[PDB]
Amino acid sequence: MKQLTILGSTGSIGCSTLDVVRHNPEHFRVVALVAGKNVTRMVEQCLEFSPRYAVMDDEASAKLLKTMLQQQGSRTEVLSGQQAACDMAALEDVDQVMAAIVGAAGLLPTLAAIRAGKTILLANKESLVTCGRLFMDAVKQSKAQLLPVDSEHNAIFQSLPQPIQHNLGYADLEQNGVVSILLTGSGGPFRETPLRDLATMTPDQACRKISVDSATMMNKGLEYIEARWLFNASASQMEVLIHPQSVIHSMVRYQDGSVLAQLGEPDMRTPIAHTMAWPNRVNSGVKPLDFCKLSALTFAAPDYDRYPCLKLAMEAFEQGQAATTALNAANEITVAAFLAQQIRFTDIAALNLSVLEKMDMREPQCVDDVLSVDANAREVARKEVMRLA
Amino acid sequence: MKQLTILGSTGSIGCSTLDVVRHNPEHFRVVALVAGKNVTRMVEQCLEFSPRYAVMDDEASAKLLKTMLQQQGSRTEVLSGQQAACDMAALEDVDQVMAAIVGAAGLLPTLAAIRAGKTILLANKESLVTCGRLFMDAVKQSKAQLLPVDSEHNAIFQSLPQPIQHNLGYADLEQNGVVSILLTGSGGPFRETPLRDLATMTPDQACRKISVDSATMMNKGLEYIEARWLFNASASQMEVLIHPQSVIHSMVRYQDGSVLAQLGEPDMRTPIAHTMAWPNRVNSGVKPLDFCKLSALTFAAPDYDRYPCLKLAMEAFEQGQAATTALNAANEITVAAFLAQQIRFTDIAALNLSVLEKMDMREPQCVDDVLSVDANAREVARKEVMRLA
Ligand SMILES: [Mn+2]
Ligand SMILES: [Mn+2]
Fold first, then answer.
1. Quick check: A215 and A189 in contact, CB under 8 A?
2. Bridge-partner residues for A151, per DSSP?
3. In angstroms, rounded to a whole number, what is the distance separating the alpha carbons of residues A54 and A224?
4. How many CA within 13 A on the CB side of residue B201?
5. Which among B282, B286, B299 has the least Cβ separation from residue A291?
6. CB–CB of A89/A110 below 8 Å?
7. Beta bridge partners of A33
8. Which residues, 6 or more positions from A204, have their beta carbon under 8 angstroms from its beta carbon?
9. What long-range pairs does B205-208 form, CB within 8 A, spacing at least 24?
10. I want to staple B242 with a disulfide (CB 3.0 to 4.6 A). Which of A182, B88, B145, B187 is the partner?
11. Up-side HSE of residue B386: CA atoms within 13 Å toward CB?
12. What domains sit in chain B, N to C, each tagged with a CATH number?
């Protein structure tokens, strides 16, 4: 009987996790739920799974949740604040922790789950994109089990040998027969748009932030960053492949020539159910892949002239966690700028390149150093967007 | 330092296994070589890998090999006969055994390796196609590690969970989260020939015996049989899929929706090296799969009106090892008949159905009962071919 804490339960990934707890009530039990300010959705979840705790961002949303829960007569105890979230991640009798809180908001709660040697269902990029160095040593020390929930990394994790699966981050690839890790991605919506035509792309031609990040492949680039930390891979042990149909979620290359892959439906309940049930399985409620109703599967090399954000993220990794924390930062600014129509689609990659260029800095050293480089690059971007409007 | 005995060393699978030992002389050592009557190739191998023993079919071939090896001054001790082979498979200090002898000739030497609790790199169909029940029980008792070497089964083995990998044949699929096993096959050369047109197919239109079994998919059917025994799967836990490109060698479906597959080049040195290095890896010398230079990947259900030998084999499994031993038997006769031009391509399927129909019998119970059913069906088939010429 696995007992868990879900960080960011009202979100997309949260509801899917609860849908897995819902279908396998025999193996899992929610002990604590942590959400943002969505009091409304939280009441429903607290009333169905009835955790011991519920945490909200502020006391305004907390007092209101206490009230609405009070009505329904729910024993669930309401708290709030980031510290309440960190306490929930470190709860004594809690086994797994869905680190689904995204942004800088999720760094300390995830980190506290880690330091407490919990089984971490890593469901956020900020963790390894900004504090990769810091987070991976924290895991080594507490021997906490990281299990990536994101489609691609989960795929790569299922396709890796068991000794690498139990010592995640601190396992040698080459030593275990792994030649490299094949990180795959759709290539985005403008995969086939002639280069000289990308400048004239609009927010409607890319239907939000995740959709633009897919079109520029900043998303893949950010996943190159995490994969490296997560799988202790070098730049030569990484491959980025364009697989438009996305049935294969990612693969792993071996010494003897074999290539192991994970395939399935886009449904997130699969990778989530995998990490939750690990080293076993449960039903997520996801549809069996119907290999008859599929599009032909194709692959191709990524053209860096078409995806500069990918090359930038790869070079940025080499430059240090200071550079990758700024890449993530500048990109949220620029993507949003392009989305509001202040800059051309092609300016996202070009302004990201600028922010990184027009910015010297020193490697972080704690969640705070990272938070500072973020707000710093956000400022160099917020200002660079203006030099264009 | 793994030490092995290769049964059928001069054959195709034998040379590749020796090529794997040749590139990884640090992990492997040949202790004994067993070949048919190809004295010529054996001398070369005995001279390169200098085993402690070399065995040949007859004394004629053996006295000749003692002479030629005598010339080159090889300390390799030459023996002969089947008993010698069984003794080579059971050698005390031998760790792995490449059961590469095919036909009835390889049933006892493989069985001897098993009874001795050795790690068996299974490289022959007869083993599980005829004596599935007997062999798997022998494994249970001896606790011998079966490692399939054939492309498809190896693929399915690499895609199964570790607890099923270490208890091969006596593991519960469903208990470990396995929904089913996806056995894939090209679909053969006449995959696209309109049905009413298959009767007029010629031996030159299917370029030998393996090529015809591919065209009729009696090969895939035979692989359905072995798979069931090898992975302890029920018919509902089996799926046969036409994958024309054959990059994916086979897959395994899981409870959460995940599908794990093994891809690579058609080279046999890959599965051979996987089983040899297991649970680790080694270089086989095989080319890394170039996902850029591939053909789009497609899949489809098999049409039983197009491949009756597949349905027959699936039905024959239900009918007992007496029926599968007869199917394998009768098909060697019909394929060869078709190959000599005594019958039409479509007659292989029909005469295989007949031999099985016009033949009642009782389940085997030892290697001999099987040899008997084999010889019995060969006679019902050898005679059925005549009723057409
Ligand atoms: Mn992803
Ligand atoms: Mn095969």
1. yes
2. none
3. 34
4. 27
5. B299
6. yes
7. A6, A54
8. none
9. B206/B345, B208/B339
10. B187
11. 6
12. 1-150 (3.40.50.720), 151-303 (no CATH), 304-389 (1.10.1740.10)
Experiment type: X-ray
Annotated binding residue A150: yes
Dihedrals phi, psi of A336, to nearest 5 degrees: -65, -35
Written as one letter, the residue type at B203 is P
Q: How far apart are CA B126 and CA B122, in angstroms?
A: 10
Which residues, 6+ apart, have CB-to-CB distance to B193 below 8 Å?
B201
User: DSSP class of residue A287?
Assistant: P
Strands (E), chain A: 2-7, 28-34, 53-56, 77-80, 96-99, 119-122, 145-148, 178-185, 238-242, 248-254, 259-263
**Residues in contact with B25: Cβ distance below 8 Å, sequence separation at least 6, in sequence order:** none
What is chain A's alpha carbon radius of gyration, rounded to the nearest angstrom?
21
Compute the distance between CA of residue B188 and CA of residue A216 in angstroms, rounded to an integer: 42
The residue among B256, B297, B303 with the most chain A CBs within 10 A of its CB, best to mutate, is B256
Q: Please name the residue that has the structure tokens 């339960």.
A: A9
**Angle CA A130–A134–A140, to nearest 5:** 135
Select from B153, B259, B282 the residue whose CB has the most chain A CBs within 10 Å, as the one to mutate to test that interface.
B259
- Cis omega before residue B279 (within 30°)? yes
**Residue written as tokens 């696209």?**
B192
User: Of B107, B120, B103, B165, nearest to B329 (Cα)?
Assistant: B103
